[PDB]
Amino acid sequence: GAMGSMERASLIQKAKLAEQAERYEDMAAFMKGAVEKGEELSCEERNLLSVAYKNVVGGQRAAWRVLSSIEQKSNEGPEVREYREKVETELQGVCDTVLGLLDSHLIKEAGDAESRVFYLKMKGDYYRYLAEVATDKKRIIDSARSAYQEAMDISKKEMPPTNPIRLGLALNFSVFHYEIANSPEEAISLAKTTFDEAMADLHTLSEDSYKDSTLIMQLLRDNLTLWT
């Protein structure tokens, strides 16, 4: 690893600075270095990892989207395809790096539901990003589905319906159903059941937990509004 020279704690500290500076590539490299130290991640540290790579891959997806749309209009010189391929190859590289970190060795060492569901959701997310770009695509979709399903089974056994990780997992799994798996009815059914079960569990939450959970439930409702 490139960050083998820096203390674990200094990598985490600099990751938070990079976030403040909105330098998400630096942030990702710092958190990649922290992971490669070999110790498990705290809840805070896991979210720093996710925030960093989600911003990096997010800019890549947005760019791939623009170029792919330009490419498809020109099909209704080689430059548009070439550069779209470059961004695409770059996006796949970031996804493979994240999946590499999860496979070596964050997932196998994650024993608590909070950490294991988080990493398996993340694994589903980044196979979903690869899927958005693939054509191979069937196998990537199955890998995404498998990771999401494993995470769902654990969250249903081990987490209350208003747990933000469980809600975010269900939200993203329903996006997978709707956008990737051509299962819009499965997407709608999962969003409804997720929303309703969380609603019934809100009475157990504190003021702050209530805010955290309802914020994510609103995304479920927004999608249902767009989907129906």
Binding site: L169, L171, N172, V175, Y178, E179, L226, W227
Partner: peptide, 7 residues
């Protein structure tokens, strides 16, 4: 496009 879990 469908809305994802936010950070």
């Amino acid at each position: 496009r469908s809305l994802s879990e936010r950070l």
